[PDB]
Amino acid sequence: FRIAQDVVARENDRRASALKEDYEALGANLARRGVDIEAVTAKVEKFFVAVPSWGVGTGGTRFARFPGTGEPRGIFDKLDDCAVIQQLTRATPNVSLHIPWDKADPKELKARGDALGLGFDAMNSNTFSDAPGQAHSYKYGSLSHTNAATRAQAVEHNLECIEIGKAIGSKALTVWIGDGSNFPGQSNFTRAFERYLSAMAEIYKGLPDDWKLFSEHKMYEPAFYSTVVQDWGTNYLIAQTLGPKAQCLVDLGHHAPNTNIEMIVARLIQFGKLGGFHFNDSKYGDDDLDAGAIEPYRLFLVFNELVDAEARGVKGFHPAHMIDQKHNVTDPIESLINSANEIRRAYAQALLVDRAALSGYQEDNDALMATETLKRAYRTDVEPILAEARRRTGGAVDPVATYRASGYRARVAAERPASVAGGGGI
Amino acid sequence: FRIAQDVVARENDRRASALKEDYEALGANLARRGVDIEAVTAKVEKFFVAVPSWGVGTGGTRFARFPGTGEPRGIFDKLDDCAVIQQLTRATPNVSLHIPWDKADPKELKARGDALGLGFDAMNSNTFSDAPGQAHSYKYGSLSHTNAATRAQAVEHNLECIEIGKAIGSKALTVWIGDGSNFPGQSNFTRAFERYLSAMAEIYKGLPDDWKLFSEHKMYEPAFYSTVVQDWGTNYLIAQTLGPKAQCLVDLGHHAPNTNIEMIVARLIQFGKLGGFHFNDSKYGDDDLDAGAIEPYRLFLVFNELVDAEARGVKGFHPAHMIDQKHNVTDPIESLINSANEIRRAYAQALLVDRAALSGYQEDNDALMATETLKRAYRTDVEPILAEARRRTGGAVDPVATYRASGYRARVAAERPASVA
Amino acid sequence: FRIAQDVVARENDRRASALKEDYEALGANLARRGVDIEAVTAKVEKFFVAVPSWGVGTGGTRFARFPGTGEPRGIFDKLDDCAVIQQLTRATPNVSLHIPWDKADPKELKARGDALGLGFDAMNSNTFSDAPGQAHSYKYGSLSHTNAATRAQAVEHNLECIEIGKAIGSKALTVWIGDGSNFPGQSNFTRAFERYLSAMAEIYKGLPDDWKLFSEHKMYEPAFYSTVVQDWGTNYLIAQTLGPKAQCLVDLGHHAPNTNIEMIVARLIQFGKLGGFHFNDSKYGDDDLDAGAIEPYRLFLVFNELVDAEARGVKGFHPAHMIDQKHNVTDPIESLINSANEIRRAYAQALLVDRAALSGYQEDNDALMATETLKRAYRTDVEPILAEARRRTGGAVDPVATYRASGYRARVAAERPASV
Amino acid sequence: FRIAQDVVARENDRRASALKEDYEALGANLARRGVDIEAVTAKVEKFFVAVPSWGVGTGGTRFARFPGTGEPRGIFDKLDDCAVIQQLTRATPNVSLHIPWDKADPKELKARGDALGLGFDAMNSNTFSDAPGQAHSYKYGSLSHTNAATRAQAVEHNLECIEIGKAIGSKALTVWIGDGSNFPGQSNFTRAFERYLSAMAEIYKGLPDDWKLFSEHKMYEPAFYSTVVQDWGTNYLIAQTLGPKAQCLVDLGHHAPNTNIEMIVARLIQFGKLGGFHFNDSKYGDDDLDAGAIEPYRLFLVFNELVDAEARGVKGFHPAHMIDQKHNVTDPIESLINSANEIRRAYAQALLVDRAALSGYQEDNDALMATETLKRAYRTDVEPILAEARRRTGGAVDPVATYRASGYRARVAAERPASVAGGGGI
Numbered sequence A, D: 001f002r003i004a005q006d007v008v009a010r011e012n013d014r015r016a017s018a019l020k021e022d023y024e025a026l027g028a029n030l031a032r033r034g035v036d037i038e039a040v041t042a043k044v045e046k047f048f049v050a051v052p053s054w055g056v057g058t059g060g061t062r063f064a065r066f067p068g069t070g071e072p073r074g075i076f077d078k079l080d081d082c083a084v085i086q087q088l089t090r091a092t093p094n095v096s097l098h099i100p101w102d103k104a105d106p107k108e109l110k111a112r113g114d115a116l117g118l119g120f121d122a123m124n125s126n127t128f129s130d131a132p133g134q135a136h137s138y139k140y141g142s143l144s145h146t147n148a149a150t151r152a153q154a155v156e157h158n159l160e161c162i163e164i165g166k167a168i169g170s171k172a173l174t175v176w177i178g179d180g181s182n183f184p185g186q187s188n189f190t191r192a193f194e195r196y197l198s199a200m201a202e203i204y205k206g207l208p209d210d211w212k213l214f215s216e217h218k219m220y221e222p223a224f225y226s227t228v229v230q231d232w233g234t235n236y237l238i239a240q241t242l243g244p245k246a247q248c249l250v251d252l253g254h255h256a257p258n259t260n261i262e263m264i265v266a267r268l269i270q271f272g273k274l275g276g277f278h279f280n281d282s283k284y285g286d287d288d289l290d291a292g293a294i295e296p297y298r299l300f301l302v303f304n305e306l307v308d309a310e311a312r313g314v315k316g317f318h319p320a321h322m323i324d325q326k327h328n329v330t331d332p333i334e335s336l337i338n339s340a341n342e343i344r345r346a347y348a349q350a351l352l353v354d355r356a357a358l359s360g361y362q363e364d365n366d367a368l369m370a371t372e373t374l375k376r377a378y379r380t381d382v383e384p385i386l387a388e389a390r391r392r393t394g395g396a397v398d399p400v401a402t403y404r405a406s407g408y409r410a411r412v413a414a415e416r417p418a419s420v421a422g423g424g425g426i
Numbered sequence B: 001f002r003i004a005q006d007v008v009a010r011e012n013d014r015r016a017s018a019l020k021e022d023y024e025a026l027g028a029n030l031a032r033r034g035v036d037i038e039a040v041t042a043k044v045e046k047f048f049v050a051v052p053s054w055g056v057g058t059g060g061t062r063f064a065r066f067p068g069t070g071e072p073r074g075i076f077d078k079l080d081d082c083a084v085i086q087q088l089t090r091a092t093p094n095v096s097l098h099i100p101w102d103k104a105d106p107k108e109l110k111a112r113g114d115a116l117g118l119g120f121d122a123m124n125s126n127t128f129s130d131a132p133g134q135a136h137s138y139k140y141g142s143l144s145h146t147n148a149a150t151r152a153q154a155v156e157h158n159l160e161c162i163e164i165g166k167a168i169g170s171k172a173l174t175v176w177i178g179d180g181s182n183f184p185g186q187s188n189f190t191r192a193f194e195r196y197l198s199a200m201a202e203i204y205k206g207l208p209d210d211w212k213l214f215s216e217h218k219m220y221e222p223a224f225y226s227t228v229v230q231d232w233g234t235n236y237l238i239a240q241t242l243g244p245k246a247q248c249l250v251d252l253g254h255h256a257p258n259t260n261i262e263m264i265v266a267r268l269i270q271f272g273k274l275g276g277f278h279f280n281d282s283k284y285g286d287d288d289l290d291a292g293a294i295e296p297y298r299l300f301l302v303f304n305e306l307v308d309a310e311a312r313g314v315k316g317f318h319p320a321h322m323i324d325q326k327h328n329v330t331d332p333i334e335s336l337i338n339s340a341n342e343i344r345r346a347y348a349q350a351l352l353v354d355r356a357a358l359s360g361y362q363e364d365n366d367a368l369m370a371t372e373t374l375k376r377a378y379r380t381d382v383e384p385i386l387a388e389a390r391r392r393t394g395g396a397v398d399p400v401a402t403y404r405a406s407g408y409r410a411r412v413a414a415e416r417p418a419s420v421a
Numbered sequence C: 001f002r003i004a005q006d007v008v009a010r011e012n013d014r015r016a017s018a019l020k021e022d023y024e025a026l027g028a029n030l031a032r033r034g035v036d037i038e039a040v041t042a043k044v045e046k047f048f049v050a051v052p053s054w055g056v057g058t059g060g061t062r063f064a065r066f067p068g069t070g071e072p073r074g075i076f077d078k079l080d081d082c083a084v085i086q087q088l089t090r091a092t093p094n095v096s097l098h099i100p101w102d103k104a105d106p107k108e109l110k111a112r113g114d115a116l117g118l119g120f121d122a123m124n125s126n127t128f129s130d131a132p133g134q135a136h137s138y139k140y141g142s143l144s145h146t147n148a149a150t151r152a153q154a155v156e157h158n159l160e161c162i163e164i165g166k167a168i169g170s171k172a173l174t175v176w177i178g179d180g181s182n183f184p185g186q187s188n189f190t191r192a193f194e195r196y197l198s199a200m201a202e203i204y205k206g207l208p209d210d211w212k213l214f215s216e217h218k219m220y221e222p223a224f225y226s227t228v229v230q231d232w233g234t235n236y237l238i239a240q241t242l243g244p245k246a247q248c249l250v251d252l253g254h255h256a257p258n259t260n261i262e263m264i265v266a267r268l269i270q271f272g273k274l275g276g277f278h279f280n281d282s283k284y285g286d287d288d289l290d291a292g293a294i295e296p297y298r299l300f301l302v303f304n305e306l307v308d309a310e311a312r313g314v315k316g317f318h319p320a321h322m323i324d325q326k327h328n329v330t331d332p333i334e335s336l337i338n339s340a341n342e343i344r345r346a347y348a349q350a351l352l353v354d355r356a357a358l359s360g361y362q363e364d365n366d367a368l369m370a371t372e373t374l375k376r377a378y379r380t381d382v383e384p385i386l387a388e389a390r391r392r393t394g395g396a397v398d399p400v401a402t403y404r405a406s407g408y409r410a411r412v413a414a415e416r417p418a419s420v
Ligand SMILES: C[C@H](O)[C@H](O)[C@@H](O)[C@@H](O)C=O
Pocket: A054, A098, A124, A176, A216, A218, A251, A278, A286, A324
């Protein structure tokens, strides 16, 4: 256990009294609303979201990076930190690896994971940056690059990612590339998309039978004029063209300003192409901020769609949920903890929606009562459920409070190399 | 002739000398660039864009409407004004009608059209507002309304539009609806879309063998939380679902801030679902401003995709071009004239692009020269080409100046009584 | 009373038991947090927001208007409807009038208001539309129109609004105009602004000593290329130039996409030019939707700034709040009721913020705990406080439920003739 | 001469015949329009825009940086490359330095500058990133940081920039910081701004009386929730508060989506607080693309306000123009060359506007003819005037073509060490 159990038990006992009062109070309120609190907690305890290995290290912008103390040295240091997140929140049992950053002996990776009690989520290929010794540069693209040898190198890399993932227990490959252009005329939109499609097809053929291929759309950055996989429409065309094992990934901060993201989710669900999510929040662009920290209601509405589907028996439906954030000004572990918590919060509130009541108001065109039906669920403070879920599953009532109480950060800082501030770079 | 021929002739003669000089200079410049100006002018004089019947009258906002003098009394007056735009620019031989605003005896509409030298483009249905006598209101939707009878009523209306279009020479029906929600929860996104798809499938059944059905997407307005046909992604699903006769219409001002609109155009083309365009310009939302008055380069970039399709040899590519604007602070006829000119302007510039050179720069990833190749065409002032194209086809060298010299606005002002209630 | 008192009492009693339990529970939770629920309820009871006379009628878009039954026609019907909102919520004791729409004999308006238990907030002028018989059209502008006589007419109109206001108990004139351009070159940005500043100076001269002159900025619509008073920067320049009686009004949905609105509010408070706040919500443009129906956290963050200003006792801080919304597909009365409720909800949550702890986290640069400190307040379901506040002040535990139980809408529908 | 004179003369003679024809044709057309092309050329030849020392090297995003060949090894190499831009375009005689990136013996800097025929524009401070060995980190701010010692350190750095600038002939200091927050509550908006103003007042106190102090606003990035100097409104408050020597700098890509930037320019001019511009283009956020590459008309409209200011008779109006761009997928020298050309292009077109005609249409509310009056100027292809201006002042008829014929990039590539692609960073 990365965090001493006596500290966890101690920090829980310290808050047990208040929790009992709040939980029983909320329990009575829900009962008056015809809702059994135990049924919600039982579901919340089972809700999981994968954490990004690259998320436990401090992030940065193109202007600078200000690392904290005890920055993780490599994937192994990172897994150790992800263990902390899972132990205290019990909501992040799986970690998502990124190659070549997390390149390591598949036997040692699987070894540490099992030891730390962590599983592995979808693999992540990297063809948006160049690595040492690389034969062809991805400066002008990768899977859609005009140079055939460059596309081939990109395809081979993605295939290597699948191999690594097969050796650690992953069951999916997520493909996000920066491919696009910064100038009108630089790229022929159609030709570039045709090339992307052809290369992706080669990756699909190399997909195991129980694997999923997720394509992630993004409006801009690193490309500032056009991006091959710029939105969900193009992403749908990709998934539909490649095959049934290919689905679409929806990263929250990857859409144009004012976009109705929850609608996109419902559409991809309708046509069976919602591969999963990349949770995070933002206000301006692809800010990659802590989930729910900026627009908590938006996060809830997205979950309202997921729960609605989760309700009206969409037999073939189990999207891969993942946190895709960058932490530039906070302890990465604390943010990921609260982000995972915020995600379960929105999930829990969505479960509180009186579906039958909502359907009625929708059918009646009672817009006011329909929206109020959602607000009644969203306004509910489900913190007692989240805390109780963690408590009875081996986690902490107040994850961050316990994290700080353990003094874990100062601990790893004394074990790891000191860091130095520098220029841009995530 | 809405505008006296002697007026046009006189106004053209007045500007003949300057036109000769500019055209010959541009012609020599183009020749040095390996381009035949006559070939460009020949293609430009054949580029047509449909004029909206509803654009000839002054528009407004939810805050107010400030009509001008001589506002069109009805559809026949509107056709009379459209004839002015076509006579002077020769770029708008076809009019787009809207039902029920333009409802009238089809034979009469057809006869006035032929008399004025005007044809008819795609019909436009209207279930975003209530007409008198409707059994059901479209307040909460139309084709996707929760009430079965309301949807049936909307379908029948669209079918009537097809019947009217069949009698006047139209070959398509454009469907833009306001259906959506203003509050989270008000609508079930998926169920509302399912109802719409079923309704559109019924309308699809009433399509003649040679007709097209265009669905127009829009991010917001009148709905301010969610819209059923909110973007091109949903629009593609619609066309793909309905069949080969159904395509998507792209209206420039209907996209989220910063959207790359020309890419959407390219994507729809690649999958054979670009039905047509609704030209206009904007800066904030669906402003419906004169085409190219705000972002002329963007308009060029859209046409660059259109011309590239032809270059790539896309088969059966025949998108329907239409102007969809509202003129709140100018003479509608003058705005539509210059808007039509701007569209031909961007088209001509797109034709000037050295695509052999461009393909080379794209292949080699020479981003700077690639973009400069597009700019060399865009920076070219093709006004002399548009003017000559008008001169040789019976139009005016300077359309707005000729319109003003004719005194048309004052004439119709004295002929048409202004609304009093 | 627009709504029978027996109805209010009956609908309160059937909800009294449940409220008791929730209020007690929340009271206990807050006590464990060092907060006295009673104190919070007391402040919520005193938080008021003006309702716009034009908000009780059904709104519409440039594409269509779909009126509901019992549509109020004229200021008298509207005042009758506004009275319901106030009786049930007790958070909207004042109504904002718009001239010429609400033009009526001052004495009659004042008496009608007093009889309904309603007061009058800021007056609103209208030079973004043409009234019949008007000598000069506002098609190309009003206060900043290139024609001198057109500007004088707009000025005279605003002065008249002040006169009407003085007679009914108003203490401010809000000025929002459509003035702008739809095409580059159509207007000379600087000259148009100079003209606006000069005309506003004339209006300022007619202000009593205790009156305020509010200027409202808007990015676009009706102008689609440029707007004279386009943002808070221009707005501040106006307030500063005009004088101490002139301040800026911030309307939520009048900003560019992604703008940090709460910051603009803080900036204006710091320089003493925050005249008022126009509440509503939006997602795309100036949608004028029900406050907090789309982004409730944003509403709370705006109030966080308002509550902080009070706490630290900022001078010149005394904003005039108003709801500026339009209801196109709901019962206007029900939306205004729930919007007023949401505004009080955000206010209450802001009041729960632990300022001492927050300040500590800000000084130590502990961003995570700082935001969590705001969230602990925001996540608190303060509905029990809002309901008890209403119950204690003659309102309804559940405003909408009581409104519907009363059958008020069917009643006015029977008294008012719809078009068809 | 970085570029051999014989190369310049050869590439000019090669295109001299065509230019003579295009220039004479344009001259006749303008003459018919009552405009003397000579008067336009004369003004264009004197229009200058400073080049950023940091724009000579290849830029990057937080995702990666793909360096080209012959990357400059330091400020001296950068100055050498800037000299190429000036020699070929003749529109960028001045270079804007950035400290500490360009820290070096100011005496030597001045020596190289004079030798290359370059001057120095405004100095640019850097408290948006930590330099090696830095005492206090700017992770949580600089001039507005809650820590007094951190603010003092930032002030001192700015004063240091002033001393360097005084030594090389600079007459201004531009201040752009990343100060802001990534989470609601993290910062107290007003207190942070008060700290900023006090710190800036200190810098202002140390400002020479023949110098100007420019503050640059930006909506977001690096801060993704709030930014202290977020817009022109806050910027005006700053300039007004500090004093007559303090003005506002407008960077095109630093505004919210759909913002009417040309109006901001007019407002600042009317109130005498427009210190200057930072030219570049964008489509999504602060893209930092080649000026006019995305929205050429907007660029013209900005220059329309500038030229109108002169037409209106505004006195003492001499804004400092500077290119603030990053080049991630092109030869930085070629991009700066064409960007400088595009800025002169827009300026030339603005000069063509018939002011008397425009004024009449504005007074009469003839919107259509007013906008058509701007378009008549904008649609005019002024390339001949730009090319002839260059040819007459020692430049190249076709800058980029001459640059490529010279083989300069290949040359410096052989003189400088090879680069390695890696993570993000500007
Ligand atoms: C590191 C990871 O590949 C990255 O976050 C992508 O998934 C996408 O979000 C980039 O904008």
